[PDB]
Every structure is written in C-alpha cells, then in structure tokens.
Amino acid sequence: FAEXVGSNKGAIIGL
C-alpha cells in the first residue's frame, strides 16, 4: 500500500 505517492500530510495506515 502507498505505492506510486506525491505528497502526504495526513495518515495512510495499513493494519
């Protein structure tokens, strides 16, 4: 997950 990702200012969470 989170695969290209330009800009992240938030949360990207895989559980």
CA distance linking residue 7 with residue 15, whole number of Å: 21
CA distance linking residue 10 with residue 13, whole number of Å: 10
Q: Which residues 1-15 are close enough to bind a second copy by CB under 8 A? A: 1-15
Q: Compute the least distance from the CB of residue 6 to a second copy, in Å.
A: 5
Q: Compute the least distance from the CB of residue 10 to a second copy, in Å.
A: 5
Q: Compute the least distance from the CB of residue 15 to a second copy, in Å.
A: 5
CA distance linking residue 8 with residue 2, whole number of Å: 10
Binding site for a second copy (CB under 8 A): 1-15
